[PDB]
């Protein structure tokens, strides 16, 4: 596993010893090279795992997440190259340092043989994101957004540390392999109920679960483009990965414990999809769509069936890619208009046809058009929920219809109609933005050819 970790660490001295005008090129090239190295991890076995050492292992649940994390950094650098043009060299190097540190923390988090190491890195990811949000943010609400993002996560995750140390004191180990092999049932007790809650709430708050999702719109709207990309693509999947890893010790308590969260997610997907219909901000709409998708992923994880797990993994990967692309498109519009309002810039297909094509493809992928992996995960989770109960189909269908509705609403409002007359500073789209969209979209359509790579360990 160190063959990935060490180059990521060496990215820092390379960045800090680079020329004043060669930081972006070197960072992008070496990040792309690191990503190529990460591709080797995908080869996975039907047996236990890829146990490299006592500290790190790899699995077909961790491998796609690691590949996505390594692939995201060059895209974030490409997106950040634009708005940081008038920045001093030291501060640009600091921004790149923050991105590299976040990648390193995520990479070490996804392998994490031992649960306290997982918690330590899962919390270490909180600092670079906070600095990025509250330092390189445009508006004055970035401070409040960062406070919300920090305190929701910490309030959720502080009981998890107590639960983990108690579990290690009782069982004797927190290594995931021993935990899996020596698992024992949980008796229906008040202490066990509260232990279940302490183990579950930390990952629930970062999904975000409906009713605990308030931090996400603030953090996503106030963050710079790279921060929004990473938050929507990788940081949301940490909760799902943690739940998938930790639900092994929560049985058979999960059968009845899951109901409050299942009801919340099933109604909250409808609520957030309906919220998306009446939104005046692109970023807020994309954030609420992310909330709906992650609520459906929560339902999948709570059902706890093989089809549920495969669908949840596929949907996590697909949502990460799609949300990153949508945020990038919104940022391209914003850097021209400086408004971040849907109704201001209209009829952009006439002025920017290729960017309109990118918008259409991104909206179709968010709409879960077959045979995209978005629909693969959606359909697997829907089938698993139907097997759980035949009445879920109503809510799932309502969510699908509303999702298509607001996706095409967002496409039509910005791309179709008549152009705004008084806006005359809409320059042709640069090659950088087009390449960013292409590198977002092509991996999705290549992955739909090999869906087994993102279906997780239960394939």
């Amino acid at each position: 596993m160190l063959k990935i970790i060490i180059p990521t660490t060496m990215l820092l001295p390379m960045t800090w010893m680079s020329k004043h005008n060669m930081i972006w090129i070197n960072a992008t090239v070496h990040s792309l090279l690191i990503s190529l190295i990460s591709l080797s991890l995908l080869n996975q076995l039907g047996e236990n795992s890829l146990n490299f050492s006592l500290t790190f292992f790899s699995d077909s649940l961790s491998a796609p997440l690691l590949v996505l994390t390594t692939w995201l950094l060059p895209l974030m650098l490409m997106a950040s190259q634009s708005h940081l043009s008038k920045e001093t060299t030291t501060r640009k190097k600091l921004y790149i340092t923050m991105l590299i540190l976040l990648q390193l923390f995520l990479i070490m988090t996804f392998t994490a043989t031992e649960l306290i190491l997982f918690y330590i890195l899962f919390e270490a990811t909180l600092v670079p994101t906070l600095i990025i949000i509250t330092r390189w943010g445009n508006q004055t609400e970035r401070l409040n957004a960062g406070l919300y993002f920090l305190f929701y996560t910490l309030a959720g995750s502080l009981p998890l540390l107590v639960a983990l140390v108690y579990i290690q004191n009782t069982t004797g180990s927190l290594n995931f392999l021993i935990i899996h092999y020596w698992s024992h049932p949980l008796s229906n007790s008040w202490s066990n109920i509260f232990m279940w809650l302490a183990c579950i709430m930390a990952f629930m708050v970062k999904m975000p679960l409906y009713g605990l999702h308030l931090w996400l719109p603030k953090a996503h709207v106030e963050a710079p483009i790279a921060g929004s990309m990473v938050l929507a693509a990788v940081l949301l999947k940490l909760g799902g990965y943690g739940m998938m890893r930790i639900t092994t010790i929560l049985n058979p308590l999960t059968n009845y414990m899951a109901y409050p969260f299942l009801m919340l997610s099933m109604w909250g997907m409808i609520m957030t999809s309906s919220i998306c219909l009446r939104q005046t901000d692109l970023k807020s709409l994309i954030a609420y769509s992310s909330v709906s998708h992650m609520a459906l992923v929560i339902v999948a994880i709570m059902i706890q069936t093989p089809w549920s797990f495969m669908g949840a993994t596929a949907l996590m990967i697909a949502h990460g890619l799609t949300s990153s692309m949508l945020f990038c498109l919104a940022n391209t519009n914003y850097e021209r208009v400086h408004s971040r309002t849907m109704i201001l810039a209209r009829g952009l297909q006439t002025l920017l046809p290729l960017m309109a094509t990118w918008w259409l493809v991104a909206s179709l992928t968010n709409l879960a058009l077959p045979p995209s992996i978005n629909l693969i995960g959606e359909l697997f989770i829907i089938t698993a929920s139907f097997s759980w109960s035949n009445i879920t189909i109503i809510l799932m269908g309502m969510n699908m219809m509303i999702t298509a509705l607001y996706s095409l609403y967002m496409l039509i409002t910005t791309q179709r109609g008549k152009y705004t007359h008084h806006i005359n500073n809409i320059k042709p789209s640069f090659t950088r933005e087009n390449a960013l969209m292409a590198l977002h979209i092509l991996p999705l359509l290549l992955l739909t050819l090999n869906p087994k790579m993102i279906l997780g360990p239960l394939y």
Binding site: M17, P185, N255, Q304, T305
Partner: protein, 121 residues
């Protein structure tokens, strides 16, 4: 645990004579390398605070910081290893001397253990 009152312990010895029976930490120990990294970071921060070229202001000063950190870290690692060795030694001695408190559990096979099965539906 509390080993302050442990018998035959000298009041201000950093490393007792019985600690010399343990293998010393290697010079390429990862913890020693981390201590050297800490010293290098201290040197860089010292350069930055004094408003000097951070990478190449004082090579002798950075070398001194790294060497001091490595030296103290080596001795600290020796003491830590000795303390953990004492803990394990006392644990094993107490288990040996109190057989009634640590009985041998009668080994049992899964084919003859009845565990409740909870279906996932």
């Amino acid at each position: 645990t509390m080993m302050s009152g442990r018998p035959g312990r000298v009041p201000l010895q950093f490393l007792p004579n019985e600690a010399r029976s343990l293998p010393p930490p290697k010079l390429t120990d990862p913890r020693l390398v981390y201590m050297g990294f800490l010293g290098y970071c201290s040197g860089l921060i010292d350069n930055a605070i004094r408003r000097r070229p951070v990478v190449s202001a004082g090579l002798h000063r950075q070398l001194l910081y790294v060497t001091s950190f490595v030296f103290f870290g080596y001795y600290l690692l020796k003491r830590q290893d000795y303390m953990y060795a004492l803990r394990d030694h006392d644990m094993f001695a107490y288990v040996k001397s109190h057989p009634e408190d640590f009985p041998e559990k009668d080994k049992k096979t899964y084919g003859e253990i009845l565990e409740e099965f909870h279906p996932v539906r």
